[PDB]
Design a protein around this ligand. Structure first.
Ligand SMILES: Cc1cc(C#N)cc(C)c1Oc1nc(NC2CCN(Cc3ccc(S(N)(=O)=O)cc3)CC2)nc2ccsc12
Ligand SMILES: [Mg+2]
Lengths: 414, 556
């Protein structure tokens, strides 16, 4: 890879000046070793004080391995980097990926280290390995090659990648390959046995056409991903409380669905009755309930993905290891809903579970739409920002905001 | 001539678009001009500046200043304008070590590097921007024009470039001498080790030997200051550390700047003096920017200050860090949103102490504050020691499990153990998850007229109990809480309450144990006295019996 690609920031924007956050001694030591080798290999160089920029760095462990991986938080640089139309006006996101029976995820970010980075842009990739207790100046570096996690790396590399895949694509016309940041998503409809080998067939490809973590494969089955429609209870005896909760849920649902009615059900709640009193359903109320049940079977109307708007993901803690979530662009027009349980590794750690939920939801958004959603997290900012890096295992990072007032609607996805 | 390595030049630029300075040179007295010519002639002999021709169009004014008992004249180049036009730099000196993170060193030497400071050349292409002019006597000849060849004192980039240049030179020596530590800040180089003093005085020699490779002359810091080192506000003693003496001024009249300085000192002191409190004192400076404004001290502020004075009577000291021992943090609740903590490795020998104050807010509770204190100490500990301490918290394991399993947000506290030191953090009420059989059901509502501010609040129950209270100077939101308050007041120890107030649910589901709203506080007090409360929400104006009835009663 000889010639660099001219890269620039967006009009009237300087480079990132983001504070490095504190790192444990074990992550510093890991980063020192990693960056010492990267520096020997020419991927990064020490920089002088005339470079004022900075991007945070930390270290992670990919799912199911023991080796530390350097992770740069390029979120600020990415949003300041010029929008890219690499060689074409855009690679259309493959709507067929989300339908494949199996999708494996490959870390191919190491391929980026073979392409030089435009010498004028390198200064904007500056980062600092901090010292413990400020006892020595942080170690200052910048990138000489396409860095993992930067928006421009896949864009600039997209010519080189399309060629590596041609012989594989030419041979397997029904396999769907989608690239997002450092990751390659490879979906096939054939049984996992040959799927696994077919994945290995593609690794050898990239291995002959060329990695510390290329050996791994994160397996997904989006054909088996389940949605969560709105469900109403089926009961033989309804208490006042039961009916009150039902009317509350249906009133919320009426903002999503036309034609929801609560008149006949409310009619049962006439008087000032004890909450535990059993109320028999009239026939008019049972019919109304039946019509609402039917309405709720059908999908929401006029829900379309607007690629010019952000995707928003909201998450609720339901307790006992269960989490619900909704993805949408305008309120009450969900593009996807879901529910998780039994997040392995933290039956006693809420924050670890939420961090895994965020990663799984982001993975679903990449597959379905090719971009990451902005999260509304049910957690205090200071708690989240203290701990999420301890459980992070993805090579991208979405954006997030914090919910400080308890939503009343947790109950209606319960 | 022993060849010496050149110090690598740092390339420097002006801010994009901006040009160099063009500031007029003031008139000087004949005496000041003679003085400046002598100083500058000497400086030129040493290589620090060079005469330039008239083509250079830039200029920075120079001044002559005089001292007290040193009847000398000193030069001064006012680079204020040039600094505004110079690019930003990486400033590698933002934070300083905290003494509690340091490890003991048998021996410490302090070298002087102010002389090496001038070996650092200034980027050649940038020198033109540093031009200045000595006016001539009687203005009858051209002014003598000079530019800098070295880092000018007072130029924006000199600290960063000097520090960076020294670190790079020192890099090989530190890496090949793992049994010593080197710390720089300003013209001082601090070298510490656990070697015997003779074998340590040799490492020092080798360091001079190394520094001379770049022609850097460096002798011991003149007038070796006896222990402790007065550094960044601390007393670094060989075996202990402290802040420099904290003396709280005595006064009858206290003013805005006094209480600011008082909190300053108290805050600085709270890193080793345990139990310092500053809420009431901090509270008194709520929104005043006239530092001359005097303020009376609330009796709760005098009590707090006098409490501080007592803690300040006897000096306290911290111990340095031993990485082979555990790291432990213990927190105490002090009241009024205030928290205090100690971090130690052995009992009674604090590394450091500190405090935490609750965030501004209408409603809050002790567990949320304790959680925030833990996160603050966690992050401070990762900075200082590179690891999380084990926590000792005044909250029962069972209390925490109830809290986090039932709280609507995700939350987490790292490895900790209960320490039975009152007051203990507890949950003061817990709402029922299901309606209570046999408990009276209260349907509550309130409403207020937005024009007149007249309102009504009340309830109707399944037993036919009813109440509507007329209210003045109120709002819908207040009447909705007042209605819940009445139901709590008038019910037995177990009660079901039905409200349509999304505002009230939002408050109560946040589980406050204390409020700035007296009315919310009154509800909390009632909740504490109940045995069981189930709070149910329903949507307003949907014909839900009981709800509909009481909505009519209160909507006058
Ligand atoms: C060397 C140094 C000096 C100062 C000052 N001002 C500040 C810092 C941050 C320094 O930098 C480091 N200091 C240490 N530890 C300390 C432990 C406590 N003492 C005080 C002392 C000891 C011995 C004598 S004595 N018997 O020689 O008279 C007198 C005074 C100094 C060293 N550890 C590190 C690790 C990396 S940098 C660094
Ligand atoms: Mg009402």
């Amino acid at each position: 890879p000889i010639e660099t690609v001219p890269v620039k920031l967006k009009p009237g924007m300087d480079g990132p000046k983001v504070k490095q956050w504190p790192l444990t001694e074990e992550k510093i030591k890991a980063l020192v070793e990693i960056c010492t080798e990267m520096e020997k290999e020419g991927k990064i160089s020490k920089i002088g004080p005339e470079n004022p920029y900075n991007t945070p760095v930390f270290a992670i462990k990919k799912k199911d391995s023991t080796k530390w991986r350097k992770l740069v938080d390029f979120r600020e640089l990415n949003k300041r980097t010029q929008d890219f139309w690499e060689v074409q006006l855009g690679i259309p996101h493959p709507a067929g990926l989300k339908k494949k029976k199996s999708v494996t995820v490959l870390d191919v970010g190491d391929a980026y280290f073979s392409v030089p980075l435009d010498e004028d842009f390198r200064k904007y990739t500056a980062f600092t390995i901090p010292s413990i207790n400020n006892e020595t100046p942080g170690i200052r570096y910048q990138y000489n090659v396409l860095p993992q996690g930067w928006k421009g790396s896949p864009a600039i590399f997209q010519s080189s990648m399309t060629k590596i895949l041609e012989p594989f694509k030419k041979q397997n016309p029904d396999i769907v390959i989608y690239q997002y940041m450092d990751d390659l998503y490879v979906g096939s409809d054939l049984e996992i046995g040959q799927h696994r080998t077919k994945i290995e067939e593609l690794r050898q490809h990239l291995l002959r056409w060329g990695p510390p973590f290329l050996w791994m494969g994160y397996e997904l089955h989006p054909d088996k991903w389940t949605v969560q429609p709105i469900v109403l209870p089926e009961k033989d005896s309804w208490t006042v409380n039961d009916i009150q909760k039902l009317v509350g849920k249906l009133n919320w649902a009426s903002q999503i669905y036309p034609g929801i009615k609560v008149r006949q059900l409310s009619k049962l709640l006439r008087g000032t009755k004890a909450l535990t009193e059993v109320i028999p359903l009239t026939e008019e109320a049972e019919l109304e309930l039946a019509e609402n049940r039917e309405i709720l079977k059908e999908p929401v109307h006029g829900v379309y993905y607007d690629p010019s708007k952000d995707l928003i993901a909201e998450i609720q803690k339901q307790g006992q290891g269960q989490w619900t979530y909704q993805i949408y662009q305008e309120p009450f027009k969900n593009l996807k809903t879901g529910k998780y349980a039994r997040m392995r590794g933290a039956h006693t750690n809420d924050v670890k579970q939420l961090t895994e939920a965020v990663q799984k939801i982001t993975t679903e958004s990449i597959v379905i739409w090719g971009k990451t959603p902005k999260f509304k997290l049910p957690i205090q900012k200071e708690t989240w920002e203290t701990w999420w890096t301890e459980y992070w295992q993805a090579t991208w990072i979405p954006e997030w905001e914090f919910v400080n007032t308890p939503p009343l609607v947790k109950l209606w996805y319960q | 001539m022993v060849p010496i390595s050149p110090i690598e030049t740092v390339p420097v630029k002006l801010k994009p678009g901006m040009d160099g300075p063009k500031v007029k040179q003031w008139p000087l007295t004949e005496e000041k001009i003679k003085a400046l010519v002598e100083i500058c002639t000497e400086m030129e002999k040493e290589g620090k500046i060079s005469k330039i021709g008239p083509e250079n169009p830039y200029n920075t004014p120079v001044f002559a200043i005089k001292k007290k008992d040193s009847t000398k004249w000193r030069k001064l180049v006012d680079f204020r304008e040039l600094n505004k036009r110079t690019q930003d730099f990486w400033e590698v000196q933002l934070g300083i070590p905290h003494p509690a993170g340091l490890k003991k060193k048998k021996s410490v030497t302090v070298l002087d590097v102010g002389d090496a400071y001038f070996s650092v050349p200034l980027d050649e292409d940038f020198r033109k921007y540093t031009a200045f002019t000595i006016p001539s006597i009687n203005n009858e000849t051209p002014g003598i024009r000079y530019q800098y060849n070295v880092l000018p004192q007072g130029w924006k980039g000199s600290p960063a470039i000097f520090q960076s240049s020294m670190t790079k030179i020192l890099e090989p020596f530190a890496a090949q001498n793992p049994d010593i530590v080197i710390y720089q800040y300003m013209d001082d180089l601090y070298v510490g080790s656990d070697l015997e003093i003779g074998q340590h005085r040799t490492k020092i020699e080798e360091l001079r030997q190394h520094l001379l490779r770049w022609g850097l002359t460096t002798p011991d810091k003149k007038h070796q200051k006896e222990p402790p080192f007065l550094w960044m506000g601390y007393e670094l003693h060989p075996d202990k550390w402290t802040v420099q003496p904290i003396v709280l001024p005595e006064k009858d009249s206290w003013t805005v700047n006094d209480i600011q300085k008082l909190v300053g000192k108290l805050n600085w002191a709270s890193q080793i003096y345990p139990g310092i409190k500053v809420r009431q004192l901090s509270k008194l400076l709520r929104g005043t920017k006239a530092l001359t404004e005097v303020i009376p001290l609330t009796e709760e502020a005098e009590l707090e200050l006098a409490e501080n004075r007592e803690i300040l009577k006897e000096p306290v000291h911290g111990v340095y860090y031993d990485p082979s021992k555990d790291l432990i943090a213990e927190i105490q609740k002090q009241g009024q949103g205030q928290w205090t903590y100690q971090i130690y490795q052995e009992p009674f020998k604090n590394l450091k102490t500190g405090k935490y104050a609750r965030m501004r807010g209408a409603h809050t509770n002790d567990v949320k504050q304790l959680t925030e204190a833990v996160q603050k100490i966690t992050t401070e500990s990762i900075v200082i020691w590179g690891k999380t301490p084990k926590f000792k918290l005044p909250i029962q394991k069972e209390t925490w499990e109830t809290w986090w399993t039932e709280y609507w947000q995700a939350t987490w506290i790292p490895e900790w153990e209960f320490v039975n030191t009152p007051p203990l953090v507890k949950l003061w009420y817990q709402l029922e998850k299901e309606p209570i059989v046999g408990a009276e059901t209260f349907y509550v509502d309130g409403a207020a007229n937005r024009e007149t501010k007249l309102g009504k609040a009340g309830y109707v129950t399944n037993k036919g109990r009813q109440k509507v209270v007329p209210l003045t100077n109120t709002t819908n939101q207040k009447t909705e809480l007042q209605a819940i308050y009445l139901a709590l007041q008038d019910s037995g120890l177990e009660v079901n309450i039905v409200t349509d107030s999304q505002y009230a649910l939002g408050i109560i589901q946040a589980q406050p144990d204390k409020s700035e709203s007296e009315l919310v506080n009154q509800i909390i007090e009632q909740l504490i006295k109940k045995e069981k409360v189930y709070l149910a929400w329903v949507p307003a104006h949907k014909g839900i019996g009981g709800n509909e009835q009481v909505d009519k009663l209160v909507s006058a």
